Design a protein around this ligand. Structure first.
Ligand code: CLA
Ligand code: CLA
Ligand code: CLA
Ligand code: CLA
Ligand code: CLA
Ligand code: CLA
Ligand code: CLA
Ligand SMILES: CCCCCCCCCCCCCCCC(=O)OC[C@H](COP(=O)(O)OC[C@@H](O)CO)OC(=O)CCCCCCCCCCCCCCC
Ligand SMILES: CC1=C(/C=C/C(C)=C/C=C/C(C)=C/C=C/C=C(C)/C=C/C=C(C)/C=C/C2=C(C)CCCC2(C)C)C(C)(C)CCC1
Ligand SMILES: CC1=C(/C=C/C(C)=C/C=C/C(C)=C/C=C/C=C(C)/C=C/C=C(C)/C=C/C2=C(C)CCCC2(C)C)C(C)(C)CCC1
Ligand SMILES: CC1=C(C/C=C(\C)CCC[C@H](C)CCC[C@H](C)CCCC(C)C)C(=O)c2ccccc2C1=O
Ligand code: SF4
Lengths: 39, 742, 77, 216, 151
């Protein structure tokens, strides 16, 4: 379990989770406030 | 004594090694000093040789990894069936296959991307697919999304079963070495078992499900009203009304009155004219006969009894005056070197895929496939690339075998030694024939371009000037067309409508196949193919024959399979490694396959594909322009690339615009690859030094010291982006063009 | 009987089983090269070195010869 | 006595096996390099367990067919094996529950019994340990997983001594083997004739010449 | 069958049915270029005769006038023109390779290993006479084909 938590922290795994979370956030901002060119 | 031999609990299942990057390698496991560590971790992940020298422990790794691959394929098929079930117009497509465009992917509405949901028919909006799954499911008698849902669940189950087996056969019950080496048992079980019982059991589905359901579809009855497949098993009279051979049941089979089954087991040939595909009664009779051949062939090699050969006996018995001892010693090599096995299998699997490309276009095996010009151009191209990649892989592991596994003291072989003893005669001969081919193929084009530019079209190699008629191919064509009445009496029509003769088959006003004419232009592009393939073999074969040594580098084998060079001396030794020959052969494989698929696209649009009239006036897509245009390079520039690129460069603003973006994107990645191929890591490492200084100035340098890619990586990165950008460009160019005009 | 094809099948089946029971075809205790005697290891209630797998071998080949002959004659006359 | 035995199958089948006829033409119980479910101790257990279920099945898959033709159970509850709802496309019958609801009760009841049984094979001393409605007094096994006995599985006291138990195990085994072939018989005769097993037994007496495996 | 060249397995060549067979070794030792003790001038005359005669074919039948009445004359002039330029290549090859005093750089041994006099073709004058024979032979061989084909 602690071995698993170490693996889940390895560069690639932490990157997909980080960027997945990022992509979801940016997608939903674009679903709620689409087509923003100003600001 | 061929028996099941397994070791119990070899490797403990633990996440301990997941937490330790590079555990498999003793060097990598210590951890990174530099960024180069990151890349070697990945480059060495599947190089099971470098992890362990024990052949048993290597075999266990490749065995469970194979289960891993099979798991991935089943999961891949699960999604294909699931999308057909949940996000497709397959049910609507069954009612109108001539018009409705297959679609099995739908994009969510975000950032304007809904435009990729195209008006494909059937009251559906989605991306037009070219994998051809719809023609498969129809030929399988699949009639509803419910049937695809169940196939997707079964595929998902098989994916779990295959993954379980991989963990099981590595951590719980791992076969011993001698179990893997029983090549006689394996060959028997694959011929009779996999190939035989696969073709027989699939023949059963074709008989009891695929034949009857397609007869209702072709008669015109609605799929929602066609009897479910199990009703042709529960009630034989349903079958007997379509094929009265089923009335007598399995009796005519055992009484050798096989001719009684001539209504669902045939030898007609040609294409079902109302569907455009091969006769499903010819196909079912094909799998039947094919299944018989493999079930008996799986009895050739000796196992736990007396009958059968030892494969070693057959090898050790073939040898001539020019060869000496012959195939002696090959059985020890092919039972102790995984790379020798992988080289042969890649060679044949690759070659076989290229054949599948040809046979599937000239003998369309699926209903309404031949007239889906987009699916058929995709299938031929897809399998050419897959085939060409696998072939280049054969040369690498042939080269890897020579560096790592070749040992004349323990596992000698006089055939391999005899070739090594005259590799200079082989490579110099292949060098000259390549120079001959290049001059007498591509040089003729240059002749034509120069003649045509000077206002002298009478001096060209053309059908209307100096003609180079492919007499031998023309002869073979005219032969096969006369086979059904003569040399193949049981055959009604030719095996393919391509066979120069016969007539034509159309589906929905679109031409499926007609006789393909072969003239001067076909002569030229065929000698380009022979030229490009020869140079590909020259580079790759040279790489394996001098993998151990050369007059320039006498101890090359000690430098390994994959190494940048042996320095600037001897005038310069960059790219002497066998690995670098594979690097150079990929570019030439890419070249060769690119003009093969270009040859395919232009010929089909020019002389085959098109629309047929009410009276039979065929209008081909590019109107026969192949004959006078494809004999100069300017003809390919102007009449092929410049003209057919219209669709992709005006795809913006329509559902084909994603091809527009991929067209430009792949150009970008291709140009980006040239940065790696044209430069060298010394420049980059010095650049990074100035950048590292800047980071140090602000206390932001990483402890993992940044390094330029290794010399070999630079080359690997270069060729990878070169192939990806190159091929993706043609992908986006082909699909936009064929979906817009097909 | 019901048919003359019955005569052709039992002929090839009995003749092939005959060619392996005593000799004139490779048995499980008699491999071939270009017939070297050997031992298999699967005992039988048949004392001629004729094994259980050997009856299947000739029995299958006896049908392959027969069916090829039966359908060869049937597709001619 | 040896049923097609070999001088390598005799190396590990030492006769100390109920039903040891030495038959192993593929060397399946070979103790060299075992693992998984290909294991000597486990294969004997699987022979016995499959043998016991087949004895219940070979009788039960022909008992309503036999009792029905005589007229001993109602003609609306006397069925062939493949037409009771086990294979709905071949035959159904309205029981007190749905055909799928019954299977849930089956796997629920068969779960408890087959799960607890597996623990005596894994941890022999168990099952008698953890409480279970006081029923755990007769769930301690015997050190033999396949022959636990006790007040629940040997309530009458058979296999009283050595010469009786091995004579009982030897007969218990050979019956399951024939019942397993019977279960195999009912299956192929069903798909090739479409009729029940006992009827196939009948028509081979009413006309052995024209009702045979060669006629179908 | 396939032996080491002259029994020496460490010379960079092989002796195969193509390199050294009784018929191969006879035909190759009978070509004018392997007549090591005969006059190099007469070698080149036979060489030029055979080549200039061969060159008339492709020039006439494939040239830019191949389908005209000026065909035989033009490709023949183009054939002699190819002999003229080749004779310059043969000449400058000799001026650069051989000096006015050097001995023959030809093998002085035989297949059995005995000492013979080297092929004087591989000398300055022996080359000068060979290329002189080629030029005379090549011009007349062009004319001889031009004689038989269009006269
Ligand atoms: C080769 C297989 C394959 C491919 C390429 C796709 C591709 C697609 N599917 Mg599909 N699908 C497949 C198999 C596949 N599917 C199978 C087998 C099933 C049945 C189970 C489905 C069921 C399915 C449904 C029900 C839907 C799709 C949808 C989609 C589309 C959007 C998916 C998306 O954005 O997810 C969102 C992205 C994520 C969930 C990724 C999250 C990122 C995390 C962090 C990654 C985790 C990484 C981790 C380390 C490893 C985890 C492994 C774990 C599984 C053990 C996309 C075109 C959607 C669609 O078409 O909508 C119109 C949709 O609704 N699919
Ligand atoms: C949770 C289950 C589990 C656990 C804890 C282990 C634990 C272990 N296994 Mg095992 N194994 C399992 C399941 C498991 N295995 C299964 C299902 C299989 C069948 C494939 C195997 C096959 C197997 C082999 C063949 C080997 C091991 C090895 C190991 C050891 C280290 C492996 C390692 O670093 O993994 C971490 C590795 C990964 C996380 C890689 C991911 C694996 C999947 C298949 C990748 C698929 C990704 C796919 C391509 C998508 C990517 C493409 C796209 C994103 C671009 C460790 C003792 C190795 C060993 O002991 O050698 C010293 C070894 O050689 N195992
Ligand atoms: C069944 C097929 C097969 C198998 C089992 C192998 C197996 C192997 N090969 Mg081989 N090979 C194959 C086919 C195969 N190859 C083919 C077809 C080619 C021709 C391209 C080669 C060329 C080749 C070379 C040149 C080398 C090997 C090497 C190896 C060994 C190490 C592999 C490793 O660790 O890579 C780890 C895998 C990776 C790091 C993956 C890299 C990512 C790839 C290159 C890009 C994929 C792009 C993708 C398709 C598109 C997505 C883009 C997207 C992400 C944006 C291993 C024994 C190496 C060796 O030394 O052997 C001992 C080696 O140097 N092979
Ligand atoms: C369009 C670009 C191009 C061209 C023309 C060539 C040409 C050649 N490459 Mg090459 N190559 C290229 C790109 C190119 N390469 C790239 C990008 C790579 C990197 C992957 C390589 C990697 C590579 C390798 C690894 C190999 C080759 C080989 C070859 C040769 C093949 C034999 C042949 O056809 O000779 C005939 C020559 C031609 C067909 C070129 C055109 C000739 C013209 C039309 C005739 C001119 C007549 C006359 C001279 C007029 C000029 C007069 C003037 C002096 C006034 C040939 C010289 C192979 C080789 O050497 O095999 C022998 C080989 O092994 N190349
Ligand atoms: C006396 C007995 C007898 C007789 C009269 C026949 C008569 C016949 N057999 Mg036959 N057969 C027999 C015994 C007999 N067989 C036995 C014992 C066997 C078992 C080995 C077979 C196995 C057999 C097969 C497998 C086939 C026949 C076929 C035929 C028919 C056409 C043969 C022909 O001319 O093809 C001409 C054949 C050639 C010219 C072969 C050259 C072409 C090859 C395929 C190309 C090379 C590719 C290479 C294989 C790779 C003919 C009616 C054929 C059939 O059904 O046709 C309708 C057929 O396919 N027979
Ligand atoms: C090509 C793949 C492959 C190969 C070569 C093997 C090879 C092996 N496995 Mg293995 N296995 C595989 C896939 C594979 N397995 C899969 C996918 C699973 C997951 C279910 C397993 C699960 C598994 C277990 C749990 C065990 C093995 C065992 C064994 C060994 C002995 C097997 C044997 O003959 O027992 C005899 C085989 C049987 C008694 C099975 C007969 C009936 C089954 C159901 C086969 C039916 C499969 C058939 C082709 C499917 C048709 C479906 C169609 C009709 C619809 C042997 C090394 C055993 C072992 O460790 O031996 C030492 C063992 O205990 N395997
Ligand atoms: C474990 C073995 C086994 C199994 C699973 C079944 C299963 C079944 N039996 Mg059954 N049966 C068996 C052994 C078995 N039998 C034996 C050994 C006998 C003879 C003593 C019978 C005698 C029997 C009768 C007399 C009847 C059933 C009936 C039934 C059905 C309903 C069960 C119920 O209501 O309770 C069901 C299909 C009933 C039914 O509808 O017949 C199919 C019914 O009336 N069984
Ligand atoms: C090509 C004709 C051909 O097939 O020759 C076949 C010729 C005869 O081989 P042997 O009879 O020595 O071979 C016996 C076994 O080694 C092969 O079964 O083999 C060669 O010597 C290869 C020649 C390569 C020559 C390349 C040109
Ligand atoms: C699509 C798909 C799928 C599915 C599949 C399937 C559905 C399959 C099936 C299959 C099957 C279902 C099979 C079957 C088989 C069978 C067999 C293979 C049989 C055999 C037989 C035999 C061999 C015979 C014998 C004999 C003889 C010879 C003589 C007389 C007697 C007897 C009859 C015994 C999955 C999900 C996976 C995945 C995804 C995709
Ligand atoms: C011992 C003895 C004896 C003898 C016996 C007998 C006489 C028997 C015979 C034997 C037999 C009687 C055998 C046979 C067998 C058979 C088999 C084994 C078969 C098989 C078949 C098959 C396998 C087929 C298949 C196929 C093919 C191959 C082709 C295609 C089609 C088909 C699918 C049909 C006596 C009495 C004298 C005395 C005492 C002792
Ligand atoms: C451009 C290129 C350079 C430099 C390019 C290298 C250094 C690639 C850099 C790869 C990545 C971008 C480095 C950073 C990777 C980290 C994982 C990034 C983390 C940040 C988050 C966003 C993930 C050389 O290494 C050289 C190698 C030899 C032949 C010529 C080539 C080549 O031309
Ligand atoms: S340039 Fe790069 S590859 Fe070529 S020799 Fe120098 S270091 Fe080695």
């Amino acid at each position: 379990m602690r071995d698993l938590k170490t693996y889940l922290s390895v560069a690639p795994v932490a990157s997909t989770l980080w960027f997945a979370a990022l992509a979801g956030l940016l997608i939903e901002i674009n679903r709620f406030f689409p087509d923003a060119l100003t600001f | 004594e061929v028996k099941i031999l397994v070791d119990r609990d070899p490797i403990k299942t633990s996440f301990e090694q997941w937490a330790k990057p590079g555990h498999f390698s003793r060097t990598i496991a210590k951890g990174p000093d530099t960024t180069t560590w990151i890349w070697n971790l990945h480059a060495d992940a599947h190089d099971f040789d470098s992890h362990t020298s024990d052949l048993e422990e290597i075999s266990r790794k490749v065995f469970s990894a194979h289960f891993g691959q099979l798991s991935i394929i089943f999961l891949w098929l699960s999604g294909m069936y699931f999308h057909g079930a949940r996000f497709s117009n397959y049910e609507a497509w069954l009612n109108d296959p001539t018009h409705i465009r297959p679609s099995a992917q739908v994009v969510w509405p975000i950032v304007g991307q809904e435009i990729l949901n195209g008006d494909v028919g059937g009251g559906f909006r989605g991306i037009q697919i070219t994998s051809g799954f719809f023609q498969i499911w129809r030929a399988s008698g699949i009639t509803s999304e419910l049937q695809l849902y169940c196939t997707a669940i079964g595929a998902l189950v098989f994916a779990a079963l295959m993954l379980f087996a991989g963990w099981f056969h590595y951590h719980k019950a791992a076969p011993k070495l001698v179990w893997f080496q029983d090549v006689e048992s394996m060959l028997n079980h694959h011929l009779a078992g996999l190939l035989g019982l696969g073709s027989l059991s699939w023949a059963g589905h074709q008989i009891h499900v695929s034949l009857p359901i397609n007869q209702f579809l072709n008669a015109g009855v609605d799929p929602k009203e066609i009897p479910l497949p199990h009703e042709f098993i529960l009630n034989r009279d349903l079958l007997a009304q379509l094929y009265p051979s089923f009335a007598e049941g399995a009796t005519p089979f055992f009484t050798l009155n096989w001719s009684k089954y001539a209504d669902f087991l045939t030898f007609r040939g040609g294409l079902d004219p109302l569907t455009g595909g091969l006769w499903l009664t010819d196909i079912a009779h094909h799998h039947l006969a094919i299944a018989i051949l493999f079930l008996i062939a799986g009895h050739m090699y000796r196992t736990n009894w007396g009958i059968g050969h030892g494969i070693k006996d057959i090898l050790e018995a073939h040898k001539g005056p020019f060869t000496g001892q012959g195939h002696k010693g090959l059985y020890e090599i092919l039972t102790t070197s995984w790379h020798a096995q992988l080289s042969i299998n890649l060679a044949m699997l690759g070659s076989l895929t290229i054949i599948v490309a040809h046979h599937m276009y000239a003998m369309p095996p699926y209903p309404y496939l031949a007239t889906d010009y987009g699916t058929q151009l995709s299938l031929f191209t897809h399998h050419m690339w897959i085939g060409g990649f696998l072939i280049v892989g054969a040369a690498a592991h042939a080269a890897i075998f020579m560096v790592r596994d070749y040992d004349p003291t323990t596992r000698y072989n006089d055939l391999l030694d005899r070739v090594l003893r005259h590799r200079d005669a082989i490579i110099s001969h292949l060098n000259w024939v390549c120079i001959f081919l290049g001059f007498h193929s591509f040089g003729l084009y240059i002749h034509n371009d120069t003649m045509s530019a000077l206002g002298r079209p009478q001096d060209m190699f053309s059908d209307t000037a100096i003609q180079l008629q492919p007499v031998f191919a023309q002869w073979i064509q005219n032969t096969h067309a006369l086979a059904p009445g003569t040399t193949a009496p049981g055959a009604t029509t030719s095996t393919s409508l391509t066979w120069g003769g016969g007539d034509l088959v159309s589906v929905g006003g679109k031409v499926a196949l007609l006789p393909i004419p072969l003239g001067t232009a076909d002569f030229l592009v065929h000698h380009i193919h022979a030229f490009t393939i020869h140079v590909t073999v020259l580079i790759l074969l040279k790489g394996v024959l001098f993998a151990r040594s050369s007059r320039l580098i006498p101890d090359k084998a000690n430098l390994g399979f994959r190494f940048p060079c042996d320095g600037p001396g001897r005038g310069g030794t960059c790219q002497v490694s066998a690995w670098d020959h594979v690097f150079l052969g990929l570019f030439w494989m890419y070249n060769a396959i690119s003009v093969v698929i270009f040859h395919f696209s232009w010929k089909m649009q020019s002389d085959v594909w098109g629309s047929i009239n009410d009276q039979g006036v065929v209008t081909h897509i590019t109107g026969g322009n192949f004959a006078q245009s494809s004999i100069t390079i300017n003809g390919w520039l102007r009449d092929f690339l410049w003209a057919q690129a219209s669709q992709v460069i005006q795809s913006y603003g329509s559902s084909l615009s994603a091809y527009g973006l991929f067209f430009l994107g792949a150009h970008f990645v291709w140009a980006f690859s040239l940065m790696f191929l044209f430069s060298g890591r010394g420049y980059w490492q010095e650049l990074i030094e100035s950048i590292v200084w800047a980071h140090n100035k602000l206390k932001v340098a990483p402890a993992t010291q940044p390094r330029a890619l290794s010399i070999v990586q630079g080359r690997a990165v270069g060729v990878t982006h070169y192939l990806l950008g190159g091929i993706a460009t043609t992908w986006a160019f082909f699909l936009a063009r064929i979906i817009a005009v097909g | 009987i019901g048919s003359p094809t019955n005569l052709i099948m039992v002929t090839s089946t009995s003749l092939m089983l005959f060619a392996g029971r005593f000799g004139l075809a490779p048995s499980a205790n008699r491999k071939a090269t270009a017939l070297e005697a050997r031992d298999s290891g699967l005992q039988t209630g048949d004392p001629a070195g004729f094994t259980l797998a050997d009856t299947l071998a000739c029995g299958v080949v006896g049908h392959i010869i027969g069916v090829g002959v039966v359908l060869g004659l049937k597709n001619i006359g | 006595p040896l049923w097609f035995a070999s001088k390598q199958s005799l190396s590990y089948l030492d006769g100390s096996l109920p039903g040891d006829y030495g038959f192993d033409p593929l060397g399946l119980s070979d103790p060299e390099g075992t693992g998984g479910f290909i294991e000597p101790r486990w294969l004997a257990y699987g022979e016995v367990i499959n043998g016991r279920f087949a004895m219940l099945g070979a009788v039960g898959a022909i008992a309503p067919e036999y009792l029905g033709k005589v007229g001993l159970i109602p003609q609306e509850t006397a069925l062939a094996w493949f037409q009771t709802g086990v294979i709905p496309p071949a035959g159904t019958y309205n029981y007190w529950a749905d055909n799928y609801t019954l299977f849930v009760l089956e796997m629920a009841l068969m779960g408890f019994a087959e799960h607890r049984r597996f623990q005596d094979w894994a941890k022999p001393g168990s099952m008698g340990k953890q409480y279970f409605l006081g029923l755990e007094k007769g769930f301690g096994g015997s050190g033999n997983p396949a022959y636990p006995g006790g007040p629940f599985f040997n309530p009458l006291g058979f296999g009283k001594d050595e010469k009786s138990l091995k004579e009982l195990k030897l007969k218990e085994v050979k019956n399951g083997r024939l019942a397993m072939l019977a279960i195999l018989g009912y299956f192929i005769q069903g798909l090739v004739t479409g009729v029940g097993p006992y009827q196939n037994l009948l028509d081979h007496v009413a006309d052995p010449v024209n009702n045979n495996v060669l006629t179908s | 069958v396939v032996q080491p060249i002259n029994g020496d397995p460490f010379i960079g060549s092989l002796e195969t049915p193509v390199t050294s067979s009784p018929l191969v070794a006879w035909y190759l030792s009978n070509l004018p270029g392997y007549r090591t003790a005969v006059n190099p001038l007469l070698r080149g005359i036979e060489v030029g005769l055979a080549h200039g005669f061969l060159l008339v074919g492709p020039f006439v039948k494939a040239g830019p006038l191949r389908n005209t009445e000026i065909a035989g004359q033009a490709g023949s002039l183009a054939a002699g023109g190819l002999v003229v330029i080749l004779s310059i290549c043969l000449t400058i090859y000799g001026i650069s390779s051989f000096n006015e005093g050097d001995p023959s750089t030809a093998p002085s041994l035989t297949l059995t290993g005995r000492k013979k006099q080297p092929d004087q073709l591989q000398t300055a004058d022996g080359w000068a006479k060979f290329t002189g024979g080629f030029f005379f032979g090549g011009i007349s061989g062009v004319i001889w084909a031009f004689f038989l084909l269009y006269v």
